[PDB]
Amino acid sequence: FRKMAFPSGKVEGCMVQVTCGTTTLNGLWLDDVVYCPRHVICTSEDMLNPNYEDLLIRKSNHNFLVQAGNVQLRVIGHSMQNCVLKLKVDTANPKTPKYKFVRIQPGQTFSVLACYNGSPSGVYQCAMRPNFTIKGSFLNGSCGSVGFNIDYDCVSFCYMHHMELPTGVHAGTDLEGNFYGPFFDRQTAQAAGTDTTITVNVLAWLYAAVINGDRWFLNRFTTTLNDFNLVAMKYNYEPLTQDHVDILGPLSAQTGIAVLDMCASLKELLQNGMNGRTILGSALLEDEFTPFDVVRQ
């Protein structure tokens, strides 16, 4: 049972390089539009305190250098949508997949295609944390890298990368340019709210451990949903809803372990610890696999 990303080819064909002045990052080329973080228009000094509408009105189409491979695409128009810039180019991307823009929920997962200078570097799986950060792997020039899910050859873009917080976690926007979380694209110290653990995902992962022959954490006990949520809240876990219980149905039916019985197991894990034992090779409770992730794998 591995953290598994979606095949990235459909997204690789969409990555381009965007330069304004001496600022360079990645863009996403779909049909005849390139989407990229708006702070590409910023000088270094601008980023410390930008007034984006005022900075953008002072730019011309010819200030935007867009490169796809070695081929320059001419910008023929531009607009700003929240924190994303939409550059109209004079060429349609022939490799545009069927796609949609979606805004995801805390706890959902997605694949990230990390890119530098318009070129793909690596692919990995991420989750939207409850505090709306993501634990990514992003370096200088990675902005404009996107997160996505793939469903029957349709790419659902959900994330575009903008910033790294001092704790090393990452913040970004949906493809309408609205940040996930209370963050904003100004270079100034920003802390995230206290994070919590995605309970439904921990349970899905415990079910994965049982589907793969590991049962040592199970117990003969049971619990009510309300009594479980009291202990979960005490340990900085998110509430478990009845919708969550229903979503875990196929995993419980597959294993014959009632959801509330697995909750009792997690409650004992939380109160007793793991005592140096491991689950699927992990020394800690893993919360970045959704129920759908477990089933698909």
Ligand X SMILES: CC(C)(C)[C@H](NC(=O)C(F)(F)F)C(=O)N1C[C@H]2[C@@H]([C@H]1C(=O)N[C@H](C=N)C[C@@H]1CCNC1=O)C2(C)C
Q: Which amino acid is at 260?
A: L
Nearest to ligand X of 142, 197 (CB atom): 142
Q: Which amino acid is at 198?
A: I
The 75-81 sheet, strands edge to edge? 71-73, 64-68, 15-20, 23-30, 33-37, 84-89, 75-81
Residue 57 C-beta: closest distance to a second copy, Å: 37
Any catalytic annotation for residue 170? no
The DSSP string of 226-264 is HHHHHHHHHTTBPPPPHHHHHHTHHHHHHHT--HHHHHH
- Contact flag: residue 5 with a second copy (CB under 8 A): yes
Selection from a second copy, ligand X, none that 214 binds (CB < 5 to 8 A by kind) is: none
Which strand (E) or helix (H) includes residue 20? strand 15-20
Residue 86 C-beta: closest distance to ligand X, Å: 18
Selection from a second copy, ligand X, none that 170 binds (CB < 5 to 8 A by kind) is: ligand X
Q: Which of 189, 171, 190, 166 is nearest to 181 (CA)?
A: 171
- Contact flag: residue 187 with a second copy (CB under 8 A): no
- Contact flag: residue 22 with ligand X (CB under 6 A): no
Residue of 17, 111, 142, 255 interacting with ligand X (CB under 6 A): 142
Cα-based angle 221, 225, 226 (whole degrees, multiple of 5): 115
Give the per-residue contact string, 115-154, with a second copy (x = CB under 8 A; - = no): -----xxxxx-x--------xxx-x---------------
Nearest to ligand X of 188, 275 (CB atom): 188
Residue 13 C-beta: closest distance to a second copy, Å: 7
Any catalytic annotation for residue 39? yes
Which residues face 147 on adjacent strands? 112, 159
- Is the distance from CB of 38 to CB of 177 less than 8 angstroms? yes
Give the per-residue contact string, 6-35, with a second copy (x = CB under 8 A; - = no): xxxxx-xx----------------------
Q: Which residue is nearest to ligand X (CB)?
A: 143
Neighbours of 140 (CB within 10 A): 8
Give the range of 66-74, 107-115, 159-167, 288-296 binding ligand X by CB under 6 A.
Answer: 159-167
Q: Show the tokens assigned to 114.
A: 């990390």
Give the range of 8-16, 160-168, 233-241, 276-284 binding ligand X by CB under 6 A.
Answer: 160-168
Distance CA 6, CA 154 (A): 12
* SS3 per residue for 164-205: ECCCCCEEEECCCCCECCCCCCCCCCCCCCCCCECHHHHHHH
Selection from a second copy, ligand X, none that 113 binds (CB < 5 to 8 A by kind) is: a second copy
Residue of 36, 41, 66, 113 interacting with a second copy (CB under 8 A): 113
Residue of 30, 36, 158, 163 interacting with ligand X (CB under 6 A): 163
Residue 265 C-beta: closest distance to ligand X, Å: 27
CA-CA-CA-CA dihedral for 252, 257, 259, 265, to nearest 10 = -140
Q: Show the tokens assigned to 152.
A: 């029957």
Give the range of 122-130, 156-164, 220-228, 260-268 binding ligand X by CB under 6 A.
Answer: 156-164
Say whether 54 sits in a helix, a strand or coil. helix
Indicate which residues carry an active-site annotation.
39, 143
